[PDB]
Amino acid sequence: AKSQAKKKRGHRLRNGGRDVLLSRGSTPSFSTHGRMTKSKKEILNKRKHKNPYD
RNA sequence: UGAUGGGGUUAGCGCAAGCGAAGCUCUUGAUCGAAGCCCCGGUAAACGGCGGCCGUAACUAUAACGGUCCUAAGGUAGCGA
Numbered sequence: 001a002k003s004q005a006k007k008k009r010g011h012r013l014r015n016g017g018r019d020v021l022l023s024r025g026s027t028p029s030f031s032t033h034g035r036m037t038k039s040k041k042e043i044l045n046k047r048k049h050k051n052p053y054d
Numbered sequence: 055u056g057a058u059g060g061g062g063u064u065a066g067c068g069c070a071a072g073c074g075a076a077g078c079u080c081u082u083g084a085u086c087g088a089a090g091c092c093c094c095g096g097u098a099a100a101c102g103g104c105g106g107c108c109g110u111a112a113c114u115a116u117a118a119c120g121g122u123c124c125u126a127a128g129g130u131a132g133c134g135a
Contacts, residue, residue: 003116004116004117004118005115005116005117006115006116007116008115008116008117009114009115009116012115012116018114018115019114020114020115020116021114021115022114023114023115024113024114024115025113025114026113027112027113
């Protein structure tokens with residue numbers, strides 16, 4: 001299914017269009033989420049290199 | 055239906071004037087008085103009626119959302135140049 005907003009956008013582009021996605025602000029090519037370095041829980045039980053116990 | 059209230063006439067009383075019973079009259083309307091109407095509900099396959107404005111979401115668009123005024127209620131499903 002296509003959304004009701006996108007159906008209204010399609011009707012207004014057929015009927016004398018403007019193509020408002022051009023007037024949308026262009027996102028960068030990367031991702032803009034929040035990057036957090038890990039916590040002590042995550043680093044303490046990350047289990048890297050899996051070296052056996054002696 | 056006619057309680058009263060008022061007037062006309064006059065037997066009589068007052069020498070003018072004026073007062074005036076009864077009767078007969080003209081009028082006034084107390085009371086009595088049902089449906090209806092006002093009132094109280096019901097009824098829309100009874101006649102009929104079924105709203106505005108503004109803001110708002112991933113940089114656009116749109117508004118699920120919210121605000122407010124009014125209403126008897128704000129047009130549902132389905133359909134739609």
